[PDB]
Structures are given as structure tokens and as C-alpha cells.
Design an enzyme around this catalytic site. Sequence first.
Site, PDB file in Angstrom:
ATOM      1  N   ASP A 152     -10.288   8.826   4.439  1.00 42.27           N
ATOM      2  CA  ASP A 152      -9.495   8.352   5.563  1.00 42.27           C
ATOM      3  C   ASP A 152      -8.158   9.076   5.522  1.00 42.27           C
ATOM      4  O   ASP A 152      -7.852   9.804   4.572  1.00 42.27           O
ATOM      5  CB  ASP A 152      -9.308   6.828   5.534  1.00 42.27           C
ATOM      6  CG  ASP A 152      -8.273   6.368   4.510  1.00 42.27           C
ATOM      7  OD1 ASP A 152      -7.748   7.195   3.739  1.00 42.27           O
ATOM      8  OD2 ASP A 152      -7.978   5.154   4.484  1.00 42.27           O
ATOM      9  N   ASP A 186      -3.941   8.311   6.083  1.00 42.89           N
ATOM     10  CA  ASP A 186      -2.970   7.225   6.016  1.00 42.89           C
ATOM     11  C   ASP A 186      -1.628   7.728   6.528  1.00 42.89           C
ATOM     12  O   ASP A 186      -1.087   8.702   5.996  1.00 42.89           O
ATOM     13  CB  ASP A 186      -2.836   6.708   4.579  1.00 42.89           C
ATOM     14  CG  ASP A 186      -4.150   6.225   4.009  1.00 42.89           C
ATOM     15  OD1 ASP A 186      -4.627   5.154   4.444  1.00 42.89           O
ATOM     16  OD2 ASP A 186      -4.719   6.925   3.142  1.00 42.89           O
ATOM     17  N   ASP A 208      -5.492   4.978   9.117  1.00 42.83           N
ATOM     18  CA  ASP A 208      -4.660   3.800   8.929  1.00 42.83           C
ATOM     19  C   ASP A 208      -3.254   4.121   9.405  1.00 42.83           C
ATOM     20  O   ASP A 208      -2.689   5.156   9.031  1.00 42.83           O
ATOM     21  CB  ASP A 208      -4.643   3.366   7.463  1.00 42.83           C
ATOM     22  CG  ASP A 208      -5.960   2.771   7.014  1.00 42.83           C
ATOM     23  OD1 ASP A 208      -6.696   2.231   7.869  1.00 42.83           O
ATOM     24  OD2 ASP A 208      -6.258   2.842   5.805  1.00 42.83           O
TER      25      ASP A 208
HETATM   26 MG   LIG Z   1      -6.337   4.090   4.137  1.00 43.64          MG
HETATM   27 MG   LIG Z   2      -6.567   6.876   2.132  1.00 44.73          MG
END
Ligand SMILES: [Mg+2]
Ligand SMILES: [Mg+2]
Length: 327
Positions: A194, A196, A251
Site C-alpha cells: 500500500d 501511506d 491510506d
Molecule cells: Mg497503510
Molecule cells: Mg504501508
Amino acid sequence: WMPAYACQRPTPLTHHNTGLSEALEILAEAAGFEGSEGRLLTFCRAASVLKALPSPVTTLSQLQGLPHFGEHSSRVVQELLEHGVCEEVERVRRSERYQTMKLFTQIFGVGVKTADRWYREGLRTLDDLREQPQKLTQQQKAGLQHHQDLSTPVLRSDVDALQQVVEEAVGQALPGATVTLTGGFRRGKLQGHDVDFLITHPKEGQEAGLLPRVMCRLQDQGLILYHQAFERSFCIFRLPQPGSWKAVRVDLVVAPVSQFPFALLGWTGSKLFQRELRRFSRKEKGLWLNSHGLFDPEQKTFFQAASEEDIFRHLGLEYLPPEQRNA
DNA sequence: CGGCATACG
DNA sequence: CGTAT
DNA sequence: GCCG
Ligand SMILES: [Mg+2]
Ligand SMILES: [Mg+2]
Ligand code: NA
């Protein structure tokens, strides 16, 4: 020589005991699948110690005096050194419980408790879950639909493209707001599961209400495949690909500038590093640390920080750059 | 033996 | 319950 | 599972 807390020693991204640490983290993961948080922590810590060593462990005696290496973790290392394989670790690898609990918990929206319940109900595969959507949340339906793309590693080349589009939306939602890359990529990782981002604004208070304005603009641009006032957003982005696209987990987090150092520190990780850091703060210094601030419970005051360096100093720790927080 | 990080959605 | 480092 |  080796301190007991991971926040007291540099841990680089690549090291000299990769095989040994990966075996212990299998046992840590399996302990988590059974709810044994204490055992998971020990195995995680023992693995991280080996990451911090300056050379490969070749003999069992080299574990003497290392923190978090008792009978169990030492025996795992011993068998790996003598035979290149640990029977317990291999037994876990091929167990139906381990494989299915790992497959289920890696779904976005599925935790250990959900995976465990499904496992007890006889479910084993992703197609098993798809056959009965009545038991799935909207979040779990999204994670299951996108599971294949989300299992594909995110590349550093992808990150720059996402940051650009996020900054564009942030800039229209609040001129002057900044976007900072955090998470594993800030620690130097070349791949990740992912991306961030940490968002703030140099004028205290201007960041209030910002994240809904960012999200609404991202959605209107057609870039949000899935999203839930708020200050954390766990999204699935539509990331362009040559002649197509792929889903990526992103995120987004907002913090007022006063709290930015604490949020940067917490969201840069690693997860073990932050747990160890907060444990160190409370148990060794009597101070309460989180991603919002550092609290002295005796004086009932919060420590003001202008930087991550400030926070390490207020905890009496030598500063570690993000690339040395890969505990 | 008690403790094991600490939040938000 | 899920999510995050 | 390990530390203090
Ligand atoms: Mg994350
Ligand atoms: Mg991450
Ligand atoms: Na999950």
C-alpha cells in the site's frame, strides 16, 4: 551490547540473517493466528534482533546474551543452522490452518477473528467466500473483488504517480496543504502492499475538515474504487497502467502541524518499531506516546515537538533515520 | 508472575 | 468488528 | 515466548 528495545538500535532494510528472521516471523504470524499476542511479540522481537546484527549468525553460541532468544527461538535457529530447515516452521508452512488463516486475513476487511470464524465454519478458499456474499461486509466485498490486484506489490514508480494526483486534489481542497510520503516507502522499501500519505497545513487549525474535501475531489476524478468528519481514510485507488489500470491500497491521514512530527513518526513505522518505541517510552521513561503527542502523566503536560529529532531527544534515544527503523 | 502500543473508522 | 504504523 |  544488543539493547533490548528495537528503538535503541538501527535496523536496516536489508541485513545478514534474512533466512533466520523469516523463519521466526512465520512462527510470530502463526502465533497471531491463534491469538497468542505475547508469543507473536517474542518471535517478532527475536527476528528483529537478527536484523540488527552486523554479520550472519553461523554458530549457536553467537546467540548467547542476545535479548529475546530463549529455548524456543534458539532451537529454531539451531535447526536452521544444522539442517537449513526447521521442522516446526515447515509444519506450520504446510498446515491447512496457517495457509487459510493467511489467505483470509490478507483480504482487506478481514481480521484474525473473522478468518478464524470462517475457518471454523469449514470455509477454505476465496471462491468459498464468493459463493455466500450474504455474510460479507461492503468492505470485505471490496477487498475480495480487488484481492488479486491488491496482492500485486506496489512499486516505487507507482508511488510518484499517486503522490502527484493526491497533491493535486489536496491543493484544491486547501491551498498550501502538503503531502508527505510515509510508511514503508519512507523507510526505503522499493515495494509495498500500500501507499501511506500524511497531510497537514502550516497554519494550525486550517487542516480541520480537510480529509472529506480531499476524498470528495478524488472520487469526482474517478480515482476511488472504494472508500468508507474523519482524519484517516483507507482507500482503494485506480492506478493507471500501460493500456489499463490496477487497484492499489492507499491510506490518507491528516494531522495538525503541531502534531505532525508525532504522526510522521508513527506512520513511518515500522509497526514493531513503533510498538517498541511506545513500550520504551512508557516503561523506561514514564511517558505516554502516540501518533498525536507525548504526554507526561506526572506533570500532566504534552511535549511540543518540531521534528522527529525532538521526539528522540525527549525520550533519551539516539536519533534513527527512517531507513534504520526497519525493525 | 504481569506485561506485552495505541490510536481511528 | 475492521483499519493503520 | 521471553524479560524484568
Ligand atoms: Mg497503510
Ligand atoms: Mg504501508
Ligand atoms: Na485483512
